[PDB]
């Protein structure tokens, strides 16, 4: 393949670090060696995270066209819209964010802390609609894009999670590249990668990047959508389009896309008692925080996989920390005593 053909705008500090999770590994029995690649600490742009890696490939296009505004969308505690807001201010572009409560949840300060609080400080026009206002049905997405034009600007459309976008899967193809370039130094290859998936272009990019060396099925996606079927399909689809985009010379098989469905419950945005125990265990053994919406569910998955001996003894598992920690602020009551 050839990813280098596509321009990458620097929005990160460079390659992200891999750290051993020795204490967690030892705590789980010592039979599996856990590591974490910190995508969550990749940028100075409002905490960055996986979405910021994806954005490096969309901005060149946004810039080539004469776009002066970035337009995106997401739920109230969306990490994506917060990263779009920071990237926009940084690039000197305006930003319009379409938002609605996409979770059956109602914390007293849900729309005023964490991610959304940052996007507002960052200068984004946060168009948060009232409950019952179904933006997706109403197609508010498009009216937002039209309002920018109508106002005299030129919008660049960034869909949910950056995923269903032609360039949305490139970033994580690069992620596989990085991983190989780093395994070169370790003198070994991680047997598995654990990654949280919802809109899909993260794991999709990984799948295309690791297919290139026969490890596509080593990417253990952990659904956090609670709608596994649609999510599995979205990752597959995005992976086949991206594979084509970068000239991979392999057809992505249904078997190349692994998405565990055991740790997504009860719904998108809601943690289960397992998610919570996972967050606390990982944080208390490594000083590494994860959230109740995304990373906490994929940490719950990994720890559970290990505990269930689903990992062949001696394996080295690379946990991809995609970010999302700021969302913890919207679930304060749950952690009031830790």
């Amino acid at each position: 393949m050839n990813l280098q053909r596509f321009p990458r705008y620097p929005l990160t500090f460079g390659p992200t670090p891999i750290q051993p999770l020795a204490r967690l590994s030892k705590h789980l029995g010592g039979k599996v060696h856990l590591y974490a690649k910190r995508e969550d600490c990749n940028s100075g742009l409002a905490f960055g995270g996986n979405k910021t890696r994806k954005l490096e490939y969309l901005i060149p296009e946004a810039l080539a066209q004469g776009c002066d505004t970035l337009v995106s969308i997401g739920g109230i505690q969306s990490n994506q819209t917060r990263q779009v807001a920071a990237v926009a201010a940084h690039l000197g572009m305006k930003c319009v964010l379409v938002q609605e409560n996409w979770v059956n949840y109602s914390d007293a300060v849900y729309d005023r802390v964490g991610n959304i609080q940052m996007s507002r400080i960052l200068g984004a026009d946060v168009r948060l609609v009232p409950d019952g206002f179904d933006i997706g049905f109403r197609r508010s997405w498009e009216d937002a894009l039209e309002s920018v034009r109508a106002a005299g600007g030129k919008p660049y459309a960034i869909p949910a999670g950056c995923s269903d976008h032609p360039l949305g899967g490139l970033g994580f193809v690069g992620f596989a590249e990085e991983v190989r370039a780093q395994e070169a130094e370790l003198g070994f290859k991680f047997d598995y990668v654990v990654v949280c998936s919802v809109t899909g272009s993260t794991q999709a990019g990984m799948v295309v990047g690791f297919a290139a060396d026969g490890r596509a099925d080593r990417v253990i996606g952990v659904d956090a959508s609670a709608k596994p079927a649609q999510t599995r399909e979205q990752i597959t689809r995005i992976a086949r389009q991206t594979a084509e985009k970068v000239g991979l010379e392999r057809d992505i098989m249904r078997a190349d896309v692994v998405l565990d469905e055991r740790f997504a419950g009860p719904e998108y945005g809601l943690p289960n008692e397992g998610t919570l125990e996972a967050i606390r265990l990982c944080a208390r053994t490594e000083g590494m925080l994860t959230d109740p919406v995304y990373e906490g569910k994929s940490m719950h998955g990994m720890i559970e996989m290990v505990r269930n001996g689903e990992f062949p003894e001696g394996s080295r598992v690379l946990y991809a920390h995609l970010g999302g920690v700021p969302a913890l602020n919207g679930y304060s009551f749950i952690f009031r005593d830790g």
Copy 2:
């Protein structure tokens, strides 16, 4: 001087990046070149920050001694106690934190979000209220050995080493850049961050270029504390000179109205910096130093052509305890 003599435990990713703040500089007239050194992005341990750099030199001692518990103290939204809670967890040590409301503030979620929330998830025993002595005692009485970490790590013998290193790091990046920064803006409250810098740059004749921006709103005491720690740290590292009072610069114009409370200028600074650079600052610390730097460039207090290095010390998570203020941005 000889800093290399003291053991530094790795708790950070490595030297912190220095980024240009091209848009902000342009916004303010372009007569001054602003940059930011990102201490707020130095670690994977619960967001880290300046305190984490300070702690790298205190940890070997805690370890050399048979200490099994890290004990610290700070206000409800203290960044320090949160970084200590994350280092403890990472090191396999227990953590006791003495938190008290050191601010005339009373937000509904003040003690449930941001820093303190992370400390509880990270497993620290968060005690809300001499509480200090009592905590230390309880650890021993419980059959443990505690390592006492004072407020902000500042009144600790090893507390100023971290930032002597910062100065060292800066000369090394200046070599690479092929140039040197003319000034350094840094927020100061407990004091060992600026004291460390003061000593570190006295080494090349730039202690007085370190521009401290008071955020304690009790300038006299803060200035004395930075002075004292700096002199003591200089002695610790074998500096050839005796730190003088003129080596310590502390602007008092941006600390209003009290510690922990932002003024309208603080909020405007936070908004301008975020909206021009995508770099967030908080209403307690960094927003005030950012306010100061901006005001300095604007009043034309920096000579035209200067290169100012803003030390971003962290603190962003505390933004969560000030949600009403920013409800509309």
Copy 3:
């Protein structure tokens, strides 16, 4: 029967008023006349409500005995415990409250506003998680004599007396209005409210006119509690009859989806009633009985011309723990 045999400690202003809900009635078709008996405005003690009418029959016993501390239990936004705290203060009694999270609901200020906030201001010892006996024992060991008040005051020998008195009061008021009510709608969870009503109205042949609306989301358990208590109370007051299953009507269609959680119908019912009558109801209890009453009317389940007495038991302060749901109305 003779309720008069039992002492009643005055904790309310006196008989609660009955108001017509002409606007809501008109809005729903004008075929069914709706009224409201305001138990929610029955006392000067922190808003009172139905639990306060219950406590009037219990206090004498606590006093007969030399009790000095009232001890109760309930969820975090329990109305029962707030009223016990207020009754305690007014009596000069200590108060210990056992509060656990009985609801699968998480809101940042859930344990800091509304009912629990008042109980703390009122001086009660609010203990957040058998915690029950533990609390009682702690009182004794402390040197005080506790009076145990079970959840909602319901499963207690004197727990049904208050609402037997309610039926008596209603009769006296019907004599004054010159007409009788055909049905009463009442929210039910721990059961002694409806139980008292069942016993009081069985006396004039209208036990089955008391339309209970389940809010526990555990219909079977709640229906059994109402029956059990109604039988015990009927024996206490000398009712000349057995309480049969036909005497206990409990609608199950409106409790969803769980105890403490409103459904969309609950919310629409709270909004409709507030906007047509200026009478507020809450998302845990009254909003569900109000939803039930509105729906019964809408479905034509009440004969045309019926006069329906809605018993508003209180609970409004709990609205504060559900701020986000109502942020835009």
Copy 4:
């Protein structure tokens, strides 16, 4: 005087009860007998309070004219706007409220709990401004085809705003008849002033005007005192007061208003706790907590004559406690 010349629309249950505060009295030495008249419990309309008593004399006019919308204004945790919202819903009228940040306070749920939460549920169009709204509100109603009835801050600066509490003194006289004695003093919290004004006029009728001890909660003493005086004289002329309101007739203590309007001092807090714990009677940190603080300190300083009977008017305001949850987290 003749208050009966003006119609009164029923929004309350009827006369408000007076209760002895025996425990609080004894707690303070037993030298002064304290009582409370419960204006805070006067209505089934979203808790009511003193503003609802005032509204009974304005609504007849709103109705006389062809008004279909009640428009009012107040701070974020305004009690006034909530009662207006409840009264409008009850009357079948629309309601538009102009809420501003009148307090230097920034609690996380300040604009979503308590009074303002109830106004939204009550169906009012609640208009907030990011950190002339009044005229835009009024015009917006006309433009929509309606007819607004304007209700100024606290109902005070209005021609009928003082009648409600003239009647309060009339009510207290009837109750004193049954009591066989007359109260020696009345303690009332004052901010926009027509509550104390109505009282000053009603008690002037029997030479007890200077017995109405207003307790300032505005932190702008001079301005509040002056507004009480003016509203009192205007009201006195409205009802036919046979005497004239003298400057000396308006008593307003300024020692308990601090540090600012909408912000409690530690004395306010102790007073709320003490009163709540000895009587089971709650007061708020903005208004009643301050007048209660006043009455307690007065008693404590022997400022009331031994044996005096002091009537504390509890005006309401308790729902605002939800906006100050952190200071009461441990009680």
